[PDB]
Design a protein around this ligand. Structure first.
Ligand SMILES: Nc1ncnc2c1ncn2[C@@H]1O[C@H](CN(CCCC[C@H]2CNCc3c2ccc(Cl)c3Cl)CC[C@H](N)C(=O)O)[C@@H](O)[C@H]1O
Ligand SMILES: Nc1ncnc2c1ncn2[C@@H]1O[C@H](CSCC[C@H](N)C(=O)O)[C@@H](O)[C@H]1O
Lengths: 260, 266
């Protein structure tokens, strides 16, 4: 409701520089949040238990790092966002247009930790080839992609990072949004959920956005109540040097959940 | 190697003051059980939920590095008939002794007992819980987790134990990560194969006050804890993190969060 108007002033390039340029975007320190997120995803896909033909990324924003390890396990990938200015920034990177964001530091680091000898250009090439479409989405609607969408449903897997808690006024609408995106997932399919812990605001240029502050326990309970078995749930505590003025995040959680 | 760091630990703890330690961590604001987002309730919930699965039971339990605290055995004591408590410091073993004798001027744990009864959901009154705990504590022993035999040779303890509980001991007495790992291997010799270890500890902490004692700690992370448990021959069944909120980031320590691990020895 009120989240809708706040996001109308969201600046993609301000969000990217706040969260994916140095210091947070410096991947040289292995104790940083960037390396921790990439490791969570790489370790999960390296188990081999998360696989299929189609995958959907919920609330992509203007970022692609969350699919770097995913893309070699799913041949049809749908990226999504509420904002068209983000879908446009995504398109600029998928089509190698001018002004695209330079994700190569993240592709590089994903290649390092996967340990398959893959060069980073091949990783990026493969991600662009498998992202078939970039669609609008609204996780508040009981059909987040609308009716009859160009997206093959139900998907084998969902990935969502920093969306649900950032679009939800409180714990209850957070739980509904989770219920809503769960309708997109085949039984036995997997959810990879990344989110901020105990956060209440972040800035994106002129936009100041409200976040529901959630704990690890509340994330687990909410995944159960939506019908998931929780395969893994991990926490990163935000160090002082990554506490800038752009938000009040206290930590990051990673959940690997399987729909029963 | 590292015998110097361990000699530094032993030395620092000769100034550990039990009553001052209890005030800092088990009276309000840290010891306030009314705030359901506080760290006291979170720890009690972790232990109560783990014992309510029915999967952690047996005859004998050892509490590793109890200090002068009993809260970590409140939910455990209905599932184990023989409990061994332990600590490095005799002043702590006397403090426990004062509470076992029900003396006035022993620390009052009844807020913790009441909270344990509340969340266990069995309608138990806190005075029956405390009576059961006092009955089932069969001995209070010196321990040193840096020794290959942390209880010493030919200890009174019934070994091997069916379960281990340890709250805030290993990371608070180890100068480095290698020491932490060796101390875990040592206490794991006390646990039977297939037995369970319940581990509570501080995350990313480098010091705390035991009144006047300002003692240094090796900061550990969740992933370091998980890896140490695997390296010791455990399967990790649960590893939860509590992030220390600002309103309880008093001057008592620089702790950033708390971990709870449920591990089973293979
Ligand atoms: N070589 C050795 N071998 C074996 N045991 C040894 C050896 N050397 C010393 N010891 C024993 O180690 C015990 C450690 N203490 C306190 C440790 C620090 C806790 C503190 C840290 N800051 C964060 C924080 C804390 C507490 C609560 C909360 Cl919430 C938070 Cl956040 C016992 C703790 C008690 N079990 C309990 O649980 O409180 C002492 O008794 C000492 O004598
Ligand atoms: N109602 C809604 N439903 C789904 N997504 C929404 C939404 N309102 C805003 N969003 C999107 O949620 C995103 C949160 S920022 C998350 C960005 C990216 N996933 C990352 O990992 O950094 C923004 O792109 C915002 O446009």
């Amino acid at each position: 409701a009120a989240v809708a108007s706040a996001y109308q002033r969201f600046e993609p390039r301000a969000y990217l520089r706040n969260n994916y340029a140095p210091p947070r975007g410096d991947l040289c320190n292995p104790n940083g949040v960037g390396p921790w997120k990439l490791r969570c995803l790489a370790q999960t896909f390296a188990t081999g238990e998360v696989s299929g033909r189609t995958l959907i990324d919920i609330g992509s924003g203007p970022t692609v790092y969350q699919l770097l390890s995913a893309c070699s396990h799913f041949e049809d990938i749908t990226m999504t966002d509420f904002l068209e200015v983000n879908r446009q920034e995504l398109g600029r990177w998928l089509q190698e247009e001018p002004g695209a964001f330079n994700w190569s530091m993240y592709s590089q680091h994903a290649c390092l930790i996967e340990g398959k000898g893959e060069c980073w250009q091949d990783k990026e090439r493969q991600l662009r080839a498998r992202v078939k479409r970039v669609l609008p989405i609204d996780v508040h609607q009981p059909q987040p992609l609308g009716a009859g969408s160009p997206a093959p449903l139900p998907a084998d897997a969902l990935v969502s990072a920093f969306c649900l808690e950032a679009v939800s006024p409180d714990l209850a609408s957070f739980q509904r949004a989770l219920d809503h995106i769960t309708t997109l997932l085949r039984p036995g399919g997997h959810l990879l959920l990344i989110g901020a812990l105990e956060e209440s605001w972040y800035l994106a240029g002129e936009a100041r956005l409200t976040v529901v502050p959630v704990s690890e326990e509340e994330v687990r309970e909410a995944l159960v109540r939506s019908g998931y078995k929780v395969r893994d749930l991990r926490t990163y505590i935000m160090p002082a040097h990554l506490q800038t003025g752009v938000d009040d995040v206290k930590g990051v959680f990673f959940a690997w959940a399987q729909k029963v």
